[PDB]
Design a protein around this ligand. Structure first.
Ligand SMILES: [Zn+2]
Ligand SMILES: [Zn+2]
Lengths: 123, 128
């Protein structure tokens, strides 16, 4: 099972995040990159709703049937954060399924929602 | 999920918000909302297989139609102001199960449904 998310915001923050889960009860691999960030730590969360009608504001609270807390990503001096996470709480199926929800990258370490996108099914 | 929502955006002026509701599991899905920035007339309105916007609408993949068409919601009609008001009931798509469209892509096309180019699209997200 595979998913993807394109992060976009009001400013320079943008990225593409990939998800892969080999077995329904196994870890989800999350990888990709985010650009346009301030150097240092940024909160990285799945929020409850895949509702982008008001940009990141409409995504609702953190997903927590917290399940949606993926930790922090770290941006380098050029503002680029590499994402390489293995997470065994989120899922691409069942009750912890994050497909159709919103991925958000935050201004501060685990602030304002800098960029987000709806998590979609990928090839 | 009993409700979904999709924000349509493209490289041009076509934009809209489409809502989906399925209050009963395996029941009909109501689809409604508005799309603007269209040329007057009919435009193909389809669910495509992948919720992949990495290359805009070009990465949405084929018309959704699992071999295991489903994704064909028909045409929307734009008026002289370029606005298409949408109100459809579809009992083939679903917000769960084999025909689930959550996390897939909704696309509005250039021509009536070959529906031609993909004017705008968005990933279908959980709304409730
Ligand atoms: Zn958050
Ligand atoms: Zn199509």
């Amino acid at each position: 099972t595979k998913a993807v998310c394109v992060l976009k915001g009001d400013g320079p923050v943008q990225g593409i995040i990939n998800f892969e889960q080999k077995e329904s009860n196994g870890p989800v691999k999350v990888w990709g990159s985010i650009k346009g960030l301030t150097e240092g730590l940024h909160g990285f969360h799945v929020h409850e709703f895949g509702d982008n009608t008001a940009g990141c504001t409409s995504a609702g609270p953190h997903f927590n049937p917290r399940v949606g807390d993926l930790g922090n990503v770290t941006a380098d001096k050029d503002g680029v954060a590499d994402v390489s996470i293995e997470d065994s709480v989120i899922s691409l199926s069942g009750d912890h399924c994050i497909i159709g929800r919103t991925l958000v990258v935050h201004e501060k370490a685990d602030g304002s929602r800098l960029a987000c996108g709806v998590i979609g099914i990928a090839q």
